[PDB]
Structure 1
Amino acid sequence: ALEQLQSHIEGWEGSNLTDICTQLLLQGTLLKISAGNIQERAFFLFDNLLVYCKRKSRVSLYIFRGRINTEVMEVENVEDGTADYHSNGYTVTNGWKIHNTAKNKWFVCMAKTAEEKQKWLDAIIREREQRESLKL
């Protein structure tokens, strides 16, 4: 299934899913504020890896846009109503920030609903906790 999924993503960069991941933990679409732009992206959280893609319009389903090793990923909650440097003045709701150390930058994610934000934050915590746990 990892190899299937990757085959549906054009312009892949870097190591293959089957080589460094075992499990798609969560997928969903989110608004991303980065470098002053707002764009919708499909996000995929795997063990060890966060990937985001542009979904192809129907006018292969995805175009690869970014990946982050979760072991160097930092995450920060954003309180609703925040409008600041990283949101470039946009009023954030249902949001959080992700640190991409590989490019020395943060970007902001926003989910459609509060429940969806909570799903993402909990999944990121669980990925971290499993990764740090003693293995069986």
Structure 2
Amino acid sequence: GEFEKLEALEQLQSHIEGWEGSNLTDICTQLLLQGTLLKISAGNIQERAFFLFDNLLVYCKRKINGSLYIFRGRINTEVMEVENVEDGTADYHSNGYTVTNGWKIHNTAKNKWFVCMAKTAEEKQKWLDAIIREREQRESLKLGMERDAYV
């Protein structure tokens, strides 16, 4: 059940070297989606492993040693905005490269942007659907709590 998923979070995290910040078992309960995406940011174009948990987005560099990943960054999804990018778009946000099957993520706490690109339209849709689901579940929990605190 829930305890088993907490142990699974601890194990998952054990495959990530150089973790920064609070532990997954303190702030997450589930993994909605993981996968490799091309990440384009001000000074880098590289593939990253992305993990979307309830409340958190993590991205890593792909690396008996259990390390598979090297920590690169995390975003509290409460301060994450996402914006679609239409195919064929090329501008400074993608460092002039043509984006297809891509979208933008805004870390509003650090005011940092980056572009994510999947390899296929179906993969992009899986990511957008998961981002929507993570936000909807989180908002539902929050509004339920506030409603019970209010009435």
- Shorter-chain TM range is over 0.9
Runs of 4+ in 1 over 6 A off after TM superposition: none
- Structure number with higher helix proportion: 2
User: Any conservation in 2 of the 1:22–1:47 contact (CA below 8 Å)?
Assistant: yes
Give the SS at the match of 1:81: coil
Change (3 A) 1:59 1:105: same
Structure 1 Cα separation of the partners of residues 141 and 118 of structure 2: 32
Q: CA deviation at 1:58?
A: 11
List alignment gaps of at least 5 residues for structure 1.
none
Q: CA deviation at 1:88?
A: 1.2
Corresponding pairs, count:
136
Q: CA deviation at 1:101?
A: 1.9
Give the SS at the match of 2:92: coil
Pair member with larger Rg? 2
Which residue of the partner structure matches residue 149 of structure 2? none
Change (3 A) 1:63 1:38: same
Q: CA deviation at 1:102?
A: 2.9
List alignment gaps of at least 5 residues for structure 2.
1-7, 144-151
Structure 1 Cα separation of the partners of residues 110 and 22 of structure 2: 18
Aligned pairs for 1:114-129 within 5 A: 114-129=121-136
Q: Considering only aligned residues, what root-mean-square deviation do their CA atoms show, in Å? A: 2.4
User: Any conservation in 2 of the 1:36–1:87 contact (CA below 8 Å)?
Assistant: no
TM-score (norm 1): 0.95
Which residue of the partner structure matches residue 4 of structure 2? none
TM-score (norm 2): 0.85
